[PDB]
Amino acid sequence: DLSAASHRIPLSDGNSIPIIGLGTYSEPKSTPKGACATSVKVAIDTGYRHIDGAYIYQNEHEVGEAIREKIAEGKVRREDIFYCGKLWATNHVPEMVRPTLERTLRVLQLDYVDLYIIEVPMAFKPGDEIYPRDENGKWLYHKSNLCATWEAMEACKDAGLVKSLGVSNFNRRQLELILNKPGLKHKPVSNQVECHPYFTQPKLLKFCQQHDIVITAYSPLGTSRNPIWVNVSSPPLLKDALLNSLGKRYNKTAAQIVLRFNIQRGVVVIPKSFNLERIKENFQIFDFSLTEEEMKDIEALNKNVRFVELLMWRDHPEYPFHDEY
Ligand SMILES: NC(=O)c1ccc[n+]([C@@H]2O[C@H](COP(=O)([O-])OP(=O)(O)OC[C@H]3O[C@@H](n4cnc5c(N)ncnc54)[C@H](OP(=O)(O)O)[C@@H]3O)[C@@H](O)[C@H]2O)c1
Numbered sequence: 657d658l659s660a661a662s663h664r665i666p667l668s669d670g671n672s673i674p675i676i677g678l679g680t681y682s683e684p685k686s687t688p689k690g691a692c693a694t695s696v697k698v699a700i701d702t703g704y705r706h707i708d709g710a711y712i713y714q715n716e717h718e719v720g721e722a723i724r725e726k727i728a729e730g731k732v733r734r735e736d737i738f739y740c741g742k743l744w745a746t747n748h749v750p751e752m753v754r755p756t757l758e759r760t761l762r763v764l765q766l767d768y769v770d771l772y773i774i775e776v777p778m779a780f781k782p783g784d785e786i787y788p789r790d791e792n793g794k795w796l797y798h799k800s801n802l803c804a805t806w807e808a809m810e811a812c813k814d815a816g817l818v819k820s821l822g823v824s825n826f827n828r829r830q831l832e833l834i835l836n837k838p839g840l841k842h843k844p845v846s847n848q849v850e851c852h853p854y855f856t857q858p859k860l861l862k863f864c865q866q867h868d869i870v871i872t873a874y875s876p877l878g879t880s881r882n883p884i885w886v887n888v889s890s891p892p893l894l895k896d897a898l899l900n901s902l903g904k905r906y907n908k909t910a911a912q913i914v915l916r917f918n919i920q921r922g923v924v925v926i927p928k929s930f931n932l933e934r935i936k937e938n939f940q941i942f943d944f945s946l947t948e949e950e951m952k953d954i955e956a957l958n959k960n961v962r963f964v965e966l967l968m969w970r971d972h973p974e975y976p977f978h979d980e981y
Pocket residue numbers: 678679680681682708709775824825848849873874875876877878879880881894909911912926927928929930931934935937938964
């Protein structure tokens with residue numbers, strides 16, 4: 657079915673999405689300039705045709721540089737590459753949506769993005785700080801209006817600036833808000849959420865499948881485990897006994913097992929690596945398949961514990977993780 661050369665899966669709007677992509681978030685202060693560009697180039701050389709980025713990752717210009725270089729040399733055409741960008745919390749006022757997308761297009765120096773998603777359902781105070789905090793370290797929120805923000809997203813697709821629209825970190829209630837919107841023109845085609853064997857998203861996945869929404873698994877390898885924002889209560893995913901045991905069977909790493917697990921169930925995976933060897937490693941997931949019993953045993957590792965909890969924002973009205981799913 658899925659192969660290195662052909663692994664795009666249908667989106668509900670008639671477009672398609674490569675089932676593996678390269679994630680591109682990297683801690684700004686601890687990442688060498690140019691590392692993102694180099695990695696995107698290597699990924700495309702390797703066979704990746706999907707890149708996940710965001711303006712607030714501070715390296716979207718590197719992503720564009722790499723994609724454009726690969727198009728220029730004839731490695732790919734624009735239509736062969738799938739780029740996903742994201743609308744951050746401080747940019748949710750409807751009037752800001754299109755100008756925010758336009759900034760990202762200018763930064764990439766591209767005519768359109770393949771997928772543009774609401775990055776979190778929470779709105780923060782508009783301004784120059786992506787993380788609005790006052791003197792008392794307090795977070796400066798803003799009142800969310802998801803349906804209104806969505807209408808502004810819809811207009812962006814109408815203008816030809818983006819092929820597909822989606823969301824990220826949305827729970828069932830927030831999804832329904834958009835799906836049940838009076839006059840809905842473009843339904844969300846994708847919800848990007850934390851997903852891996854320690855947090856398998858059983859209910860949210862079923863709900864999304866009901867509405868023909870594809871799940872994209874962010875932190876599909878269990879995160880970089882940066883204590884600053886990652887919940888390190890759970891042991892390292894890639895050190896899991898079962899995942900490693902199954903790895904021996906296929907002569908694959910635990911990483912390869914966990915990526916195969918999600919793509920085999922129709923979940924898009926966007927592992928980040930800026931390492932030459934690991935970029936290649938993560939892509940070698942089309943030359944084996946897991947048995948049904950193996951799939952069952954992997955799913956059974958589910959802990960219902962998130963590596964990405966975002967506790968700082970539990971008090972925002974649109975915090976997505978209070979609900980069961
Ligand atoms: N929408 C959201 O709110 C949201 C949230 C989190 C992440 N994301 C997106 O999802 C992408 C993926 O998630 P993430 O970066 O948090 O985490 P991740 O992809 O689960 O894990 C990345 C960490 O794993 C390492 N790694 C990669 N391949 C490896 C391999 N084969 N073996 C051992 N270690 C490996 C990376 O280091 P090296 O680079 O040194 O290989 C890095 O430290 C992001 O980069 C971003 O594009 C979106």
